[PDB]
């Protein structure tokens, strides 16, 4: 069904976790397709900014510093994951206005 959807997040393993999920009585046959599509779009939306963050520092392997910078550089992803805190991250390079010497 991954090939029948043309996607990459496997709808069958999603279907197995949704059966052992205590979520309703019955699980449809297109709902895990829809869900795997939404998850694929979000993972692509983050890895795009991850690639940009690895490109800004000319680094090959994406490190979690790149991930943290890529999350805080977006505005909608900050509004989603603001109560989420990633390990190894650090924060934005952030300097206030009155702190610099005049």
């Amino acid at each position: 069904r991954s090939s029948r959807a043309g996607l990459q997040f496997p709808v069958g393993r999603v279907h197995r976790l949704l059966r052992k999920g205590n979520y309703s009585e019955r699980v449809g046959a297109g709902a895990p397709v829809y869900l795997a599509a939404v998850l694929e779009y979000l993972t692509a939306e983050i890895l795009e900014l991850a690639g940009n963050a690895a490109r800004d520092n000319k680094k090959t392997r994406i490190i979690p510093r790149h991930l943290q910078l890529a999350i805080r550089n977006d505005e909608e992803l900050n509004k989603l994951l603001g109560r989420v805190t990633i390990a190894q991250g650090g924060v934005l390079p952030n300097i206030q206005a009155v702190l610099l010497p005049k």
Partner: protein
């Protein structure tokens, strides 16, 4: 006959209605979804059939 625009003009129905299947094996599967493929026969087995 490439100018035979009426030929094309009654074709485009068929093309654009079969357009929902843009590659091979989901087509073979859409066949097996009718073609005497006993349900449960896995997707690659249905396609073999």
């Amino acid at each position: 006959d490439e100018n035979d625009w009426q030929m094309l003009e009654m074709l485009k129905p068929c093309i654009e209605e079969g357009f929902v299947i843009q590659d091979k094996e989901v087509a073979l599967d859409f066949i097996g979804r009718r073609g005497s493929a006993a349900l449960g026969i896995r997707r690659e087995k249905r396609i073999q059939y």
